[PDB]
Ligand binder design. Structure first.
Ligand SMILES: NC(=O)c1ccc[n+]([C@@H]2O[C@H](COP(=O)([O-])OP(=O)(O)OC[C@H]3O[C@@H](n4cnc5c(N)ncnc54)[C@H](O)[C@@H]3O)[C@@H](O)[C@H]2O)c1
Ligand SMILES: NC(=O)c1ccc[n+]([C@@H]2O[C@H](COP(=O)([O-])OP(=O)(O)OC[C@H]3O[C@@H](n4cnc5c(N)ncnc54)[C@H](O)[C@@H]3O)[C@@H](O)[C@H]2O)c1
Ligand SMILES: CC(=O)N[C@@H]1[C@@H](O)[C@@H](O)[C@@H](CO)O[C@@H]1O
Ligand SMILES: CC(=O)N[C@@H]1[C@@H](O)[C@@H](O)[C@@H](CO)O[C@@H]1O
Lengths: 426, 426
């Protein structure tokens, strides 16, 4: 009756998923696979806090997930591992017959992207792209407004991961602490272990899903529309080196590393039905958090400046606002057009509840498994978004040359229907 | 002692320059060249209003400017003609030995751009790019902050001409009126006569200077830095056709024209010293006016949302704001770092005065002529900005292919010094 879920990687993000599942009565958390004992310990404390019994632990090295996947009891797994581990963990899960919730990132290679889709089609095991910003309360209100016809026909959108990650990319290596040092790699903690290395060896749109995801759902990408091609420009890198010097002096070994990842990487994308999308990757500079959303059509325009609250944006609807030629605050619009799903289940996610947009993402994951239904953000969408990373790197290496984005759906995009948040439950 | 100025084209923008000159005691307005008697009449009324004597009128057809340029008394001319007339009027002026103030736009061809620079170098007659948004009060305050070191090292900027021009591109053809009809071409009035045709036959960044200009001055383009290459993406065109139908029904002949100009055209530009610039052209859709500025460096970030007032933006300075991670209103920063030029001469441009940013632009023009000094925004800058248009069209025709931007300075950019608003007078 209830879904048996396990976790490959219970680091800081894995722990969030553990909490979401631990708060449900329709799920049993069977097992964890993580080589770090400290991370496993906090995950076990989340279970104990929610009155659920401990999980079986597979903590013997990097390959112990293989032994966890042999458990026939497990229905589905969450994959919350480092970027370089996503493909190996995800395809091994589908081959073992486990439904997969895959954390966001970009692909290491374009080949990974195709292999996700091909393994999933052959095994018949579906995968969900765990993009939580698609469930953000303001974004869902805008989706509702778009579908009501309030924006008219969309022509353009922007978004991007613009979040100061300097204190996450560098720390002391002390368990549980960020922003308290200048170390990265083998001796660092959490994301500083693995993420910062990508900034050293690569230059591209390393994290596209948070900005492209919402636009995907609004412009029907892979569901009547698709992404055609892209071009990426990268600025110089200055922010990470400056951070290391300001926090840990010029004497530190890490003040000597030349970072390849430009501070701002912008990406233009053409869509089949004529829309354009501009993404921005911005994680090594001082700034407030703001994903920089813009949704623009023939009858409506929305721009945000915050982290998703009702009043943290501007909106203009010509025909509804008497051709005033002035921005309105987004506030009364986000509240009035709050998505039905949020209006119904608010108190499971906020106030008396917990998780926010993450509650709703993981709720859709579990409800689709219980109902035996296709995910609204599926393996084809994962592959598409993931492919933006390798193709952007090739664009930058070619001084901005245009790269065709593959059609991972093989013509299926033409007739596929948008099923993202089309009801008030999941 | 005083500068003798004449005007090729006294349409709506020419009239503004006429008023600026008519209010000065160090200028004599000698002559007008315009084939439209209605436009000449309002310009003559501006002189009469300011107690200055009438101008000699050259109104016999399109070529009568040639006869005006034979007047040896004329020191300088303002060129405020349609885009397709800029090159012919500008080079004929320099060849006749007249200093030129050239209105903004883009080039019709890349060849025009080179011919401006080559004619100017051969004749020895300088040309000023009349970019007024460079003198906008908030932009000048940000320039001041950048030069004070408050943004640290710049890595990225955005801007764009984002201004709803539907009521300017279509009118009834009645003299003096806009937004009152759906006609364009030979029977329309003012910009509807000529500008709208470009939307029908072309697709690109048709108007780059308002957004790139401010960034030019802040990133030292052509003055220690330069623009290397670009790539342009264009969305579908939907806004102009929809406007025609909503205002004048489907029965109108103009509801039948397929517009080539996409509603949103975005352009990525690489700079020599590592910065990137993204421009946006957005003139055929509903929206409030906002040029969408972003200035981003290692210690500061600014974004605006209005038409240039002090409180119509957000700003973040990590080290000055106690690492708060929250936007501040731009207001107290724009007021505290108001450019010296504005603080000194405020009452000549606003309040008791007139013109705003246009006062300051035309003041720099006249003061450079009186002092026999090089313009801060010169023929090389005109050519550079102008070249963004033809190269964007070629990029769009090549599905976003990267285009090299020529070096119109021939290596002079390396050692040239930024002289834009480096004093409190001009
Ligand atoms: N969508 C979101 O809101 C969101 C938020 C944070 C992180 N993330 C994503 O989640 C993923 C993980 O990020 P994080 O912040 O939790 O990093 P983290 O360093 O805290 O966690 C990674 C965990 O993976 C474990 N691990 C590494 N190799 C393994 C292996 N071979 N087998 C099993 N476990 C292994 C580590 O021991 C660690 O516990 C990344 O892809 C990141 O981008 C998404
Ligand atoms: N920088 C700014 O703030 C700003 C503002 C408005 C317009 N502009 C620019 O100014 C220019 C003109 O725009 P406008 O709004 O004044 O258009 P307009 O139609 O009102 O004026 C154009 C004038 O040029 C005249 N003209 C056409 N051909 C001529 C010729 N061969 N010889 C002499 N005169 C001729 C017309 O009769 C008309 O009076 C354009 O390049 C436009 O982009 C700049
Ligand atoms: C929605 C959101 O911004 N998510 C990001 C997540 O993807 C990851 O980058 C993390 C690093 O600490 O910071 C945020 O939580
Ligand atoms: C600074 C500013 O936005 N200038 C523009 C100008 O360039 C032109 O496009 C005009 C059309 O009516 O609208 C504005 O005044």
């Amino acid at each position: 009756k209830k879904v048996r879920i396990a976790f490959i990687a219970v680091g800081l993000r894995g722990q969030t998923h553990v909490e979401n599942m631990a708060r449900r009565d329709d799920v049993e958390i069977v097992a964890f696979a993580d080589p770090d004992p400290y991370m496993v310990g906090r995950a076990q404390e989340i279970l104990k806090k929610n009155g659920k019994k401990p999980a079986k632990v597979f903590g013997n090295g990097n390959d112990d997930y293989k032994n966890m996947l042999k458990d026939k009891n497990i229905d589905a797994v969450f994959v919350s591992s480092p970027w370089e581990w996503h493909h190996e963990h995800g395809v091994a899960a589908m081959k073992a017959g486990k439904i997969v919730g895959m954390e966001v990132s970009g692909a290491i290679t374009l080949e990974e992207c195709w292999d996700y889709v091909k393994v999933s089609e052959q095994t018949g095991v579906p995968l969900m792209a765990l993009e939580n910003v698609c469930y953000r309360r303001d974004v869902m209100a805008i989706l509702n407004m778009v579908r009501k016809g309030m924006f008219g026909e969309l022509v353009h959108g922007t978004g991007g991961y613009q979040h100061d990650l300097r204190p996450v990319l560098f720390n002391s290596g002390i368990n549980g602490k960020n922003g308290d040092g200048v170390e990265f790699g083998e001796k660092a903690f959490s994301e500083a272990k693995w993420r910062t290395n990508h900034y050293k060896n690569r230059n591209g749109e390393l994290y596209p899903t948070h900005g492209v995801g919402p636009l995907h759902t609004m412009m029907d990408i892979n569901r009547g529309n698709r992404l055609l091609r892209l071009s990426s420009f990268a600025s110089k890198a200055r922010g990470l080196h400056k951070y290391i010097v300001d926090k840990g002096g010029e004497s530190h070994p890490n003040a000597k590393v030349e970072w390849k990842q430009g501070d701002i990487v912008t990406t233009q994308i053409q869509c089949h039905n004529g829309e354009t999308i501009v993404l921005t990757h911005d994680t090594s500079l001082q700034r407030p958090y703001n994903l920089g959303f813009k949704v623009q059509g023939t009858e409506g325009l929305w721009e945000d400046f915050g982290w998703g609250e009702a009043a943290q944006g501007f909106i203009y609807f010509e025909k509804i606002m008497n051709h005033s030629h002035r921005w309105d605050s987004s506030e009364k619009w986000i509240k009035e057009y709050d998505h039905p799903m949020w209006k119904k289940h608010e108190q499971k996610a906020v106030g008396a509840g917990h998780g926010g947009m993450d509650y709703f993402l993981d709720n859709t994951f579990v409800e689709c498994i219980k109902r035996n239904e296709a995910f609204p953000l599926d393996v084809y969408d994962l592959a598409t978004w993931y492919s933006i990373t390798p193709l952007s790197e090739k664009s930058i290496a070619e001084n901005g040359a245009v790269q065709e984005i593959p059609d991972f759906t093989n013509g299926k995009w033409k007739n596929a229907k948008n099923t993202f948040a089309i009801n008030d439950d999941y």
